[PDB]
Amino acid sequence: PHCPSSQLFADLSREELTAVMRFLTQRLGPGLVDAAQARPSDNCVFSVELQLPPKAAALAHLDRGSPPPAREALAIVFFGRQPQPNVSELVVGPLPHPSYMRDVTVERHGGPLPYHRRPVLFQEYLDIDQMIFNRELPQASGLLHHCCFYKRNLVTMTTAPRGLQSGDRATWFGLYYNISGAGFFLHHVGLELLVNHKALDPARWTIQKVFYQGRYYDSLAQLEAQFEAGLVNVVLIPDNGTGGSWSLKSPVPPGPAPPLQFYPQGPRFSVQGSRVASSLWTFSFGLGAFSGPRIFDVRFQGERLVYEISLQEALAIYGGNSPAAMTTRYVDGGFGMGKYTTPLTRGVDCPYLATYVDWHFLLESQAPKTIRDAFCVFEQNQGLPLRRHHSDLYSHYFGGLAETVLVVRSMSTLLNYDYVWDTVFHPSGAIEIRFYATGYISSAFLFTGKYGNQVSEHTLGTVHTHSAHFKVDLDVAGLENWVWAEDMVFVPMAVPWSPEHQLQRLQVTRKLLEMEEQAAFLVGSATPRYLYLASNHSNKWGHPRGYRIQMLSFAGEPLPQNSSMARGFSWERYQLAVTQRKEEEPSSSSVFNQNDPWAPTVDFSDFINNETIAGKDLVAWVTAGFLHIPHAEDIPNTVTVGNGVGFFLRPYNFFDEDPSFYSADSIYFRGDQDAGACEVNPLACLPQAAACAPDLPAFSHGGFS
Amino acid sequence: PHCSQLFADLSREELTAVMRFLTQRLGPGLVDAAQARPSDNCVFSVELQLPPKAAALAHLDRGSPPPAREALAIVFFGRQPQPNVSELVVGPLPHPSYMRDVTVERHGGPLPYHRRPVLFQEYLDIDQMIFNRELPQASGLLHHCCFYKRNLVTMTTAPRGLQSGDRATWFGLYYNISGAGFFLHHVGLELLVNHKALDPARWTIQKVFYQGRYYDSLAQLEAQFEAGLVNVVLIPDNGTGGSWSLKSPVPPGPAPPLQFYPQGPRFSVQGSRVASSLWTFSFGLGAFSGPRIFDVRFQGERLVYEISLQEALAIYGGNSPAAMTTRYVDGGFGMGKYTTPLTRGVDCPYLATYVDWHFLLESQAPKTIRDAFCVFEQNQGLPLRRHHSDLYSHYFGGLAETVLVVRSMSTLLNYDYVWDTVFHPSGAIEIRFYATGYISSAFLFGATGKYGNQVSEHTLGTVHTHSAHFKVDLDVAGLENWVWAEDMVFVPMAVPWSPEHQLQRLQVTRKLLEMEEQAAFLVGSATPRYLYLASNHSNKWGHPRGYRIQMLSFAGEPLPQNSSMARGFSWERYQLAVTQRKEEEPSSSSVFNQNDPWAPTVDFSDFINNETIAGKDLVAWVTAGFLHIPHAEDIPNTVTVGNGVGFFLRPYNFFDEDPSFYSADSIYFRGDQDAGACEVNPLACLPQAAACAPDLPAFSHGGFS
């Protein structure tokens, strides 16, 4: 019966956000508009979020005990009501009650930010739909009545980038049936429209091209005419149906409950604000609006391993029979991995008994909002030994330890993909960063196999690749680190005790990587089997104290350099790169690359620049991804099984021995001892320990927009 | 509130039945393996002989009668002018009447006697020699360095010599540590024992290695010690920490997470057969080959006829002779034969279903390994699939992932190998293997860094690679299958609507692999990103029904072909290979390769022989492995974290849609609906469903030998 239970990196709070918005409205001139109903020629505030502190100061505070650096915020402002409109980046502080505001644009980017680089606003999307649905589609209502039950029952979906050339803002939009309670993405009606929305005055916006069921037209006029002329043979795309194409609700009623996990003697970790603490682990967590999930000041048994691990960008490159598909290259940070974090459904997205946590933000609005259950944090019994030995030889003993990990997770739903961002903390001292793609695939109307598979009636599942970039600022036993590569080789040799014979002598090769360029591994290149970052200092046995990067990635072929667009996500070309850490190089991407990748705001390749990486504060940049050719089993959704991709950070002579030796949960007993004796073996007391019904919270869901 | 066996391993009776029959028909002269000497006649092994496929299938599908249930016996025929090992098929069970020598049929000639595995008694005899005859000759030295006075133990290596016919084995000497691994306590002495002679009296010691130097005999070593040329390095007898212990110095804290089935378990085990809602298969263990599964059926339909471990391999490098020539072909010892008991709540989850294995190896009566297998459902704490829609329609639809696992563990000397087969709700099968347990060590001398890392006082952790081979006989939608490779490519192109501009057009490349040699991928070769086996027949959307092999492997560089030994495990050279399935090609290895790899009994490369694989019964052969350079954190044991290696088998247009759409456990609800309303959302009723204390069984352990 019955059964128990330094925030310098925290994301800005409701107050802090409000505080900065007040200060902005005051100091920014009226004509300021609510971003959420702004127009191109308006002035407004697009985003307000935490500006991360410099490392030197942050550390001085965390370690040396000096005072905290100014807590600041960064605001992105669209300045439209202006002869030469610009986007500007403004640092506002110091919180909790700000007094200054500095334009860092020219500092950071060496010049103004072109207005065309700004992300398409929510209002801008609405205006575009007004044009399409009021001014444009009616011109073809003859056709639409015949194919598409026109009478409102159709929806548009954006693509990106928006044109062919720096400056452009023309966007292809596909049209789909507005299915109810299920993904529309699988119901392309066959029509795409090239909208030019560069003009500051929506009245001047035009439609450059039209694609319909396999053919280009110049206007909806033509397309309607040609349909009327009788040289457009409409194949009828249905409005309605049943199965996974049409639904997510299963036709099969609940059977017996699946397995459930619980903490029989209370949870073994705490979350206070942005800070998690456990027996072994300590870190602060959070979300960049655009860059997405991040962790800081990660400490294993009190000692810092990493200053920062943050998602940096995500990328989806498509191919297709149609214009939308065949030119789409989402640089998802230009929308926002944080901005589009969705709530975590208890018992689906994370285990029911996880600790859920809310996120607060201020984006494209005046008042801050909240995503409820944005994060989840929990311990998972992996059902699998961290370590184990059974000795039947000479001495009869057993010694092992079941693996229980600590997880932190957010999910981003950008249009149809749901990205899943795991950071898993292992009891061995290892950190694992994973990401899964799930959700709906993106589809096109089907009209010879070069561009994907047919996944349902009239539907091409368009081929594409996923990839993601991570900043990993390890500070292994201090700031000053070196990069080591180790591998294997065989060397023919006469057998010492019988030289008439030949043996193949297995050996270890070892090289220190001295310059940045030697630590930059292009995709498709051979990669050292052991690569690690290490300190000057050694462990008990005289080896440099190291942490090793090990990669789980099936990376797709990158967009060719021959493409002008590529410089906008040049990180795609590397598997891994280690560079000097620098304040002026905080990120591999920028929210402004999505709309102008031809003139990238940040260009990652520039960071790799022929310097020493021999004894500096280093930072590793890891790419992970894969190629996806959709298939029937992606309908309704793509499963996560086998699609996880990422990397491990594992200790390599960092410790003097395996930390888990002194685990509070390790089991050990001799063959002559009594394995059922509770005092001998803790597992024997488990049935007492766990003789209680768990107190499960009432199911709540974090709602919608 | 509380909460066809046509593939089954032979039972106690069947084993007894066969041994009785063998005793009778094998003439007198027949000794018990545990007592046998080289010149004796004895029965080494009795285990299931797997049925032919055509007959097995006829029974399983067409309903015809079962094929004869038979057994295979390995017999050592020593009491003979020309001694041989012979393979004998005995049947039909339950009460056998015949017995057929298949040796010459199968291997095209007699099995040389020197290929036989070293018997337990043979190991004991060898120790008599060492400890009675030999070591006393160097007791002067041994008293000085090693607390000689019995307190030392030997460990074998393999293969045994330099050339087909040889049977000389290096044995290292270690302190017989109590209740912890001896493997970390090499005293610095290895002895080359020649035990080829049928008369142990004639066995000799060809060489001696001590603390860095070679001697012809123990006479020599002692003569040279007493002559003042051998400088002993005292290796301690005793100590504390992970070098010496597996018992933690830290007392139990609060219990870790525990998983349970709140409305009963959702699978059954009847004998060798598992059944669940989705999955159906028979499981078991080959004495030598190890874990295997048969007649795997997703929702009633066969995906795989057989998935079986085939061989495991550990290739070493080192400063000393044992380390530098060791190549364990573990099947020559036996992955089943050395299955250890699974400790409840360490090796598998506490509430797993544990199952015993019966065997008859190197003895006259059958024995049992208690809790050899475990079978359980695991909540992965991670969604199989999920979508959150804030866009146009407000809905959520997902499904938490619960997998079905089957696991055994083999402890071969120091390593404990974990063998997972995980069955996913998506229709995917996953085969994993982890290496844990103790590393193998050597005494540390010399300044090279070429052969590993120092992991404790005076201990070299010797570099080596692990690898494992699996037979995967998929029968995708029937027997007749083809092999497909798909990948990606970019193709420059004029932008259709703006030909002044260039786009990189992503496309899918596809190729049918026609001949065996085209499906044979060497290690280090580029591999198609999508490789699958498929049927002639298509799904609803016209694509061939496929299952795809996706590989999680960090494979080490293979032993060079230049080595005569290599032919004994030539599968090591491939990542993957598809060949025609053939009755006369049942296995990629043989228990007789370990001792004569120079004249291999089975040579895998011979299977790949320039035939069609276009529309035959095909079988894939997957290699997985990795390089291990030991480091401090391998002491006391190597952890499983990130060391799992294996592959997935995923449906690729096999179905018409994701079968998890019709999951009994999928959650779905619209934003306008009530997510707490139990009738709407099953997760809401969970706190009722799981308001009960679990009835945990009293802890038992399966004991030792």
Ligand SMILES: *[C@@H]1O[C@H](CO)[C@@H](O[C@@H]2O[C@H](CO)[C@@H](O[C@@H]3O[C@H](CO)[C@@H](O)[C@H](O)[C@@H]3O)[C@H](O)[C@H]2NC(C)=O)[C@H](O)[C@H]1NC(C)=O
């Ligand atoms: C990008 O656009 C922003 C928005 O217009 C520009 O900010 C404004 O720049 C001028 C400085 O050239 C400032 O106003 C001026 O104030 C001084 C006295 O303080 C006076 O000489 C002038 O009569 C004028 O009013 C003001 O700092 C600033 N306004 C706001 C609301 O921030 C920005 O400079 C543009 N920058 C680039 C590089 O494009």
Ligand SMILES: *[C@@H]1O[C@H](CO)[C@@H](O[C@@H]2O[C@H](CO)[C@@H](O[C@@H]3O[C@H](CO)[C@@H](O)[C@H](O)[C@@H]3O)[C@H](O)[C@H]2NC(C)=O)[C@H](O)[C@H]1NC(C)=O
């Ligand atoms: C490997 O070793 C075994 C040692 O027994 C050989 O098997 C034996 O082969 C002999 C033939 O030399 C069989 O004897 C035959 O049966 C009757 C017994 O009444 C005998 O009088 C006949 O004249 C005939 O020689 C014996 O049955 C058989 N035993 C078994 C278990 O097979 C075997 O030949 C050897 N194999 C090879 C390939 O060298």
Ligand SMILES: *[C@@H]1O[C@H](CO[C@H]2O[C@@H](C)[C@@H](O)[C@@H](O)[C@@H]2O)[C@@H](O[C@@H]2O[C@H](CO)[C@@H](O)[C@H](O)[C@H]2NC(C)=O)[C@H](O)[C@H]1NC(C)=O
């Ligand atoms: C690890 O290096 C520290 C720090 O190293 C600086 O010394 C330069 C020669 C060069 O190596 C530079 O990269 C490196 O950052 C060593 O201590 C330093 O040692 C010097 C002696 O040469 C002293 O005079 C300095 O006070 C001290 N400087 C600092 C900044 O600490 C240290 O010896 C070494 N330790 C090991 C085990 O390698």
Ligand SMILES: *[C@@H]1O[C@H](CO)[C@@H](O[C@@H]2O[C@H](CO)[C@@H](O)[C@H](O)[C@H]2NC(C)=O)[C@H](O)[C@H]1NC(C)=O
């Ligand atoms: C080697 O050392 C082991 C470890 O002590 C000895 O194991 C003990 O042996 C005695 C005698 O049989 C038993 O009563 C104890 O219960 C054993 N302990 C364990 C943990 O098994 C073993 O006997 C020694 N082997 C030798 C000397 O060869």
Ligand SMILES: *[C@H]1O[C@H](CO[C@H]2O[C@@H](C)[C@@H](O)[C@@H](O)[C@@H]2O)[C@@H](O)[C@H](O)[C@H]1NC(C)=O
């Ligand atoms: C697929 O093949 C089946 C018969 O297979 C043989 O037929 C020949 C044309 C030759 O290609 C052989 O190699 C084949 O193995 C046939 O009976 C099936 O119905 C066929 N079905 C389809 C849809 O292709």
Ligand SMILES: *[C@@H]1O[C@H](CO)[C@@H](O)[C@H](O)[C@H]1NC(C)=O
């Ligand atoms: C989806 O359906 C309803 C019509 O019942 C509509 O109000 C909604 O907005 C549709 N999507 C649109 C209009 O974009």
Ligand SMILES: [Ca+2]
């Ligand atoms: Ca660093």
Ligand SMILES: [Ca+2]
């Ligand atoms: Ca740099």
Ligand SMILES: [Ca+2]
């Ligand atoms: Ca087959």
Ligand SMILES: [Ca+2]
């Ligand atoms: Ca063949």
Ligand SMILES: [Cu+2]
């Ligand atoms: Cu995808």
Ligand SMILES: [Cu+2]
């Ligand atoms: Cu290993």
